[PDB]
RNA sequence: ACGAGAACGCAGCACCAGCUGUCCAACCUGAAGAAGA
């Protein structure tokens, strides 16, 4: 008979996996200066063009 | 100078009454973004 056995997942490691891919600098930034990067959204990134 | 002549087989009348094209059934099965970029 199925039984339930809860089980968790302590990622201590970075993780990578498939969904999908993105090509250079064109809607991310990759900043240098204090060395951070950023991805953008979608619906305020297409108001901010409207406007 | 016909066993003759004259004489509508015609008049009234709903192929109609009751009746679920219903009952059971999963659009379901099997299938890593890796890899020497």
């Given at each position: ?9 302590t ?10 891919e ?26 901010y063009?409207?406007?």
């Open positions: 008979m199925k039984k339930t056995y809860r089980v968790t997942l990622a201590l490691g970075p993780i990578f996996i498939g969904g999908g993105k090509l250079k600098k064109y809607e991310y930034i990759f900043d240098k200066q204090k060395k951070v990067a950023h991805m953008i959204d979608h619906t305020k990134f297409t108001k063009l409207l406007e």
